[PDB]
Every structure is written in structure tokens, then in C-alpha cells.
Amino acid sequence: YFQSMIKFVTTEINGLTLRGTAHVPDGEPGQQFPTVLMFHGFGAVRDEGFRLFIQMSNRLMENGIAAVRFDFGCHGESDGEFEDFTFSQELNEGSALIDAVKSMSFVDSTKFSLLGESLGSVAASIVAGKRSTELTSLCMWSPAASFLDEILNDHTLQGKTVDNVEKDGYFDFYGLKLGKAFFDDLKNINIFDNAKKYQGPVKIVYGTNDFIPEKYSHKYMDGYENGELVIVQDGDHGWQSVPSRKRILDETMKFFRKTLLEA
Amino acid sequence: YFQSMIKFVTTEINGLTLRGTAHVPDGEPGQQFPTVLMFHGFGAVRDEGFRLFIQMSNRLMENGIAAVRFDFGCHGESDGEFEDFTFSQELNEGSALIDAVKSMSFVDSTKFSLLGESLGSVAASIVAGKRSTELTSLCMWSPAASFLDEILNDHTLQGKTVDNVEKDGYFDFYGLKLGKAFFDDLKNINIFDNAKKYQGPVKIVYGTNDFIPEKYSHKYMDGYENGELVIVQDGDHGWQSVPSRKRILDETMKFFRKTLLEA
Ligand SMILES: COc1cc(/C=C/C(=O)O)ccc1O
Ligand SMILES: COc1cc(/C=C/C(=O)O)ccc1O
Ligand SMILES: COc1cc(/C=C/C(=O)O)ccc1O
Ligand SMILES: COc1cc(/C=C/C(=O)O)ccc1O
Ligand SMILES: [Ca+2]
Ligand SMILES: [Ca+2]
């Protein structure tokens, strides 16, 4: 037998080392577990805000579900400069992470789901649609699916102008340099036509104080044949109150218990 | 001969596993390097905000200085619940981390310094005073040395009332539960008398947009025999603009080159 354990993992994807963390439940040698792979948000790290993904990871692990979470390229401790980041690269890494994590020794590749937060939810929704037979279920927190509309139609990124990127070479995001390549890549991105290709169980959790408009979650639901939308009164983008934190952890554990442990 | 590498490290302190990252310069097998240990801020993680400690670690590593950074107990990926967190535990851990890192194969026990950000700077100042003969130098960014005054005199923590802790059972910090034990323990904490015991080279970097009052940096200077205070015009608490991020990385590399490489 073996007690539960936290271990660090790395993988190489198109020339970048991505670094991550794995929460393995207790079990016998060689035992394989239903697994959730988690995608963090824009300019975030694999911990997520204020231990959010760590708390979710340990909750899953304490219930027999392995939890795996990597820093995307150009984020956190992975290789890559933010100035070179593109959302296309994030989607390509998300696809390659499915294959890398399904190959890990403790992962039951037949019981395998994605969890996202904010922009990570967007990536997860698109990856799920392109890899529509690979995922047992999909859970999306606070999907930041307005970012194309905001940048391309309103010419702002979280409220700050993008109109100087061409002249000045980059966008200043909290001290990080976001390059022109990111912006030139937005023309290649499609959210909802990709996302609606996934027909498995989907849960979306939206908080009424999220700065993303609620309409985007209803657009997702419009395309999902097997979706569920939970609206958390007074929940915010990052689940940054003790009551909304308890709610997001509980709602997500319930979904993955249903789709990974009881199906 | 080995190229530079990033690796993950753990240690056990008072029954908690603390988890961290080490950036090791390239060199010969078994080589021992001058080393900086970094302490993150309150409710933060070892990466720090927006890759701040990651960029600093890599800058040091590319110049022949090893960089090591752990999540404190009850923070990040380390063991422990935020509700059980106390600053006394952080101080004990910061002291114990000196020996955990100096035990590592790549670390020169005689060329070892601390770097802090915000509350981590306060922790580093106190640990430095108690273990003065262990440190070649000390660098403190944005020291949050007002927290005792703010909580004990003004009954707020970063502006939010602490007067409901007994009624609520906790203090809500961005969705984490901060417990009564933290507030009960504040009476045990002494910053400035402990800090002035360190007589090695100290550098403080303060940004004019920091929400921490500037007078706390001057108070530190009053007690240091070999201190230097750099005031970064338009710098902020987390160095979250591209100009101030460049500035903080350069000012810190200059200081550790002087104190760890050229001395
Ligand atoms: C990249 O541009 C954007 C990102 C977000 C949110 C991202 C997240 O929280 O992960 C919101 C609006 C944007 O225009
Ligand atoms: C690469 O990441 C960064 C680099 C700089 C400085 C660059 C320079 O020395 O010219 C500033 C902010 C950054 O986020
Ligand atoms: C814990 O109480 C406080 C913490 C801070 C900042 C901490 C940090 O930025 O690391 C500032 C004021 C406080 O009263
Ligand atoms: C452990 O830290 C937390 C616990 C809760 C509540 C959990 C429950 O009662 O189920 C909410 C937020 C937290 O940050
Ligand atoms: Ca020990
Ligand atoms: Ca442990």
C-alpha cells in the first residue's frame, strides 16, 4: 500500500519544458485513478489565486481522484517568455498535456476530465471540442470567453487599451510584457463553434459578481447537449470569499464524483 | 559538466512538508554556489506575483548565483491550513530554512543571503537578526512592516476590519480562512529590535506607489549600520509595471553581485 502523495512533474512540448504538480490518492502499487487535469487563467499560475487549485486538488485527492495541474508555457515556472505567448500555443499545449498526462503511471486514461478557471476554461472548452472523444467530463469556472470581443471590438484588455501595441511593441500586463504575436494570433481563435463539438457532461459555475458578462455562459449552454449551469449568488471571478470558496469546491467535487466515481 | 537546471525541493519543519524550487547555475559536478533564499509575502506563493520571484531566480541563476524559494507553511503547495497560520511559525520556518538550504549539495554555506518581498521582507529582517552570522547580505523589497501597527492600533488588515473575527470565527482573506491563532500570536512579534541585530550589508528597495507607508523603511534604516535605501520613483508594492520590474531585477542583481560575487 501507499499513502497519498504530492509530486512534481515535467513535460516537454514543442521546445518548452512545462512544469506541474500531481496529487495522487492513496492506493496500492501501480493503481490507476480517475484524473482531473486543471487549466489556470491568463497570466496566472498552476496554484491559481489564493490556493484555489491547491484546495481543489487536495479535495479530489482525498476522494480517490488524482489532480494534475501544469503552468502553461510562458506562465509560472514553465519555460517561455510572456512576450512570446499566444493563445494558439496555449491550446496546443492543452492538447499535448492531455496526451502527456494520460500516459502517466497513476492515470486511468478512460476516466479523465478537464477543469478550467477563467481563460483556462476557455482553453479547456476549445480543447474539449477538438478532442471530443478524449474527455469523460468538463467543468468550467468563470469562463473568460469575452476576451476576443473585448480586445477586437472594444480595443481593451481587462479595461486597458491595446491600441499602442503596434507602435510600442508590447502590452504591459502587471509588469509582464505581452507581445504583438499574442494580438496577431487572436484572428485564429474560435471559441463557440469549437466548444459545441463536445457532447459529454459539462458543468459551468458562474458567480453573479464576475466581471465577465453572464451572457457568455448562456452561449456555452446553448451549444452543449449535456450542460449544467450553476449560478452562485455573490460569487466572484476568483472565488475570493470564504462562502463562495466553499461553494465552488463543493459544487466541483459533486460533479466529478458523479462523472468519474459513480458513472 | 552540467548545464543550469530547475529542480523541486522539499523539507520537513515542525511536522509540515514545505515545498520549493531551486534554480542551479551551470557548473562542475558537486560545485557549491553562492545562494539567495527568497521569502514570499502574506498569503502569496513562492512564484510571487506575476512571475516576480521566477524572473529574479533566473536572473541570479544565469549569473552564477543559486536561487531557492519555498512556500511557507500554510501557503502555496506546502502543508498546513491558512486557519492555523501564525507569524511565529513563519519566523521559525524561515530560520529552519537556512539550514535546510545550506544542507543542499549545490549551496555554499559561507556565501548565503536572504531576499524578501513584502511580509517576507519582515520575516527576513527578523530571521537575519536572530541568525546574523549565517547571512552574507540581506535584501528587502517593499517591507510590509506596518502590519502590527495596522492590525493592533487601527484594527484593520489591508484596510478590512479585524473586529468581526470572534463573531465570524475567522478573518476572510480572499477566500482563505485566517484564524484566531494568527491574531493571538501578534503580541509575540518584535520587528525592529530583532532587525537591528543584523549588521551586515542590507539593501531596501521601496516604490513610491507602495501602499505601505515609507516611514517603515526609514525606521529600518535607523537601526542598520550598513544599510542602503533605494526609492524607486513610481515603483509599486509588487513591481507590477514593466519599468519597475526591470528596475527591481537590476537593482537586486547589482546588490547580490556586489555582496556574493565581488566580495
Ligand atoms: C486576455 O484578455 C482578457 C482576459 C480576461 C480574463 C482572463 C483570466 O482571468 O484568465 C478577461 C478579458 C480579457 O480581454
Ligand atoms: C522579460 O521579462 C521582463 C523584462 C524586463 C526588462 C527587460 C530589459 O532588460 O530590457 C521588464 C519586464 C519584464 O516582464
Ligand atoms: C497581515 O497583515 C498585513 C499584511 C500586509 C502585506 C503583506 C504582504 O504584502 O506580504 C499589509 C498590512 C497588513 O496589516
Ligand atoms: C480550508 O479553507 C477554506 C474552507 C472553506 C470551507 C470549507 C467547508 O466548510 O466545506 C472555505 C474557504 C476556505 O479557504
Ligand atoms: Ca527537518
Ligand atoms: Ca507531509
Is the Cα torsion angle B59, B61, B62, B64 positive or negative in sign? positive
Is the Cα torsion angle A5, B74, A68, B66 positive or negative in sign? negative
Half-sphere exposure of B174 (CA within 13 A, CB side): 14
Nearest CA owner, ligand 4 atom 9: A246
| Grid cell digits, residue B40 | 514570499
CA of B90 to the centre of ligand 4 (A): 22
Is the Cα torsion angle B72, B74, B78, B80 positive or negative in sign? positive
CA end-to-end span of chain B, whole Å?
26
Q: What are the C-alpha distances in Å from A155 to residues A43, A71, A159, A163, A170?
A: 19, 28, 9, 7, 14
Sheet of B16-24: strands edge to edge? B5-13, B16-24, B66-70, B33-39, B107-117, B138-141, B202-207, B227-232
Q: CB distance B174–A19 less than 8 Å?
A: no
Q: Give the span between the Cα atoms of B261 and B263, in whole angstroms.
A: 6
Q: Give the span between the Cα atoms of A94 and A99, in whole angstroms.
A: 9
DSSP B94-138: HHHHHHHHHTSTTEEEEEEEEEEETHHHHHHHHHHHHTGGG-S-E
10 Å CB burial of residue A76 (0-12, 13-18, 19+) is: buried
Q: What is the dihedral of CA A170, A172, A177, A181, to 10 degrees?
A: -40
Which residues form ligand 2's pocket by a CB distance below 6 Å?
A: A 81, 175-177; B 55, 242, 245-246
Contact at 8 Å (CB) between B207 and B235? yes
DSSP code for A183: H
Q: At what angle do helices B242-256 and B52-62 cross, to 10 degrees?
A: 40
Q: Given in angstroms, what resolution was this structure solved at?
A: 1.9
The residue type found at A67 is A
Which atom number of ligand 1 is nearest to the Cα of residue A157?
Answer: 14
Q: CB distance B174–A54 less than 8 Å?
A: no
DSSP 3-state assignment of B8? strand
Report which bound ligand comes closest to the CA of A82: 2
Contacts of B178 in chain A (CB under 8 A): none
Count of other CB atoms within 10 angstroms of residue B29 = 7
CA of A52 to the centre of ligand 6 (A): 19
- The Cα of A55 is separated from the nearest Cα of chain B by a number of Å equal to 9
Q: CB distance A49–B174 less than 8 Å?
A: yes
Location of C-alpha cell 547571512: B135
Q: CB distance B245–A176 less than 8 Å?
A: yes
List the Cα angle B72/B13/A67 in 5-degree steps.
60
Closest CA to A252 of A141, A142, A111, A145: A141
CA of A21 to the centre of ligand 1 (A): 24
Q: Give the span between the Cα atoms of B11 and A49, in whole angstroms.
A: 24
Closest CA to B139 of B159, B161, B107, B117: B117
Q: Name the H helices within chain B.
A: 52-62, 87-102, 119-130, 147-154, 165-168, 180-185, 192-195, 215-223, 242-256
Q: B230: Cβ–Cβ under 8 A, 6 or more apart, which residues? A: B203, B204, B205, B206, B251
Q: What are the C-alpha distances in Å from B35 to residues B116, B127, B147?
A: 14, 16, 29
Contact at 8 Å (CB) between B202 and B177? no
Nearest CA owner, ligand 4 atom 6: A246
Half-sphere exposure of A153 (CA within 13 A, CB side): 5
Q: Give the span between the Cα atoms of A43 and A7, in whole angstroms.
A: 23
Which atom number of ligand 4 is nearest to the Cα of residue B176?
Answer: 14
Count of other CB atoms within 10 angstroms of residue B184 = 11
The residue type found at A8 is F
Beta bridge partners of B231: B206
Closest CA to B216 of B142, B154, B161: B142
Location of C-alpha cell 475567522: B170
- Best mutation site among A117, A158, A173, A206 for ligand 1 pocket (most ligand atoms within 8 Å of CB): A158
Instruction: Kindly provide the b/e burial profile for residues A121-150, where b requires at least 16 CB atoms within 10 angstroms of the residue's own CB.
Output: bbbbbbbbbebeebbbbbbbbbbbbbbbeb
Closest CA to A169 of A75, A67, A83: A83
Q: Give the span between the Cα atoms of A16 and A93, in whole angstroms.
A: 10
- The Cα of B226 is separated from the nearest Cα of chain A by a number of Å equal to 30
